[PDB]
Amino acid sequence: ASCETTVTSGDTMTYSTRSISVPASCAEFTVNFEHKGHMPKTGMGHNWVLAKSADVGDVAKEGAHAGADNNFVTPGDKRVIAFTPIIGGGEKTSVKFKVSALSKDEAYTYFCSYPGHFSMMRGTLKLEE
Numbered sequence: 233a234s235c236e237t238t239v240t241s242g243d244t245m246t247y248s249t250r251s252i253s254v255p256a257s258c259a260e261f262t263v264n265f266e267h268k269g270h271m272p273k274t275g276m277g278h279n280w281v282l283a284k285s286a287d288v289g290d291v292a293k294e295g296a297h298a299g300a301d302n303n304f305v306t307p308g309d310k311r312v313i314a315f316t317p318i319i320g321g322g323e324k325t326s327v328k329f330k331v332s333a334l335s336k337d338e339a340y341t342y343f344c345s346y347p348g349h350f351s352m353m354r355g356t357l358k359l360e361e
């Protein structure tokens with residue numbers, strides 16, 4: 233469908249894709265996020281969080297202290313452009329954001345903010361005209 237992608241995860245520290253392109257003719261963009269694990273497992277919860285590449289470390293290290301009830305993202309953090317809740321095996325979620333929040337000229341990284349995952353679990357997002 234036009235302005236959307238699907239990203240999956242499972243019982244590993246990797247997303248299904250390391251690159252996402254957002255068409256600049258979109259007004260809104262939807263990221264569908266699936267966890268293909270079979271059951272909820274310790275240390276295997278995942279989400280999808282978007283920020284400028286320079287902000288990743290700060291957002292994740294601060295977000296870790298937000299707790300599981302806040303989905304490991306600091307409430308109301310302006311560095312976070314969009315995020316999904318933490319999901320476990322068998323679940324799915326979605327986040328829709330405005331394309332006007334993005335800039336060509338800026339560098340973006342999506343990552344998982346479950347404690348410790350952000351180092352390996354990440355990818356690049358680009359606004360493509």
Ligand SMILES: [Cu+2]
Nearest residue numbers: 278344346349
């Ligand atoms: Cu994760």
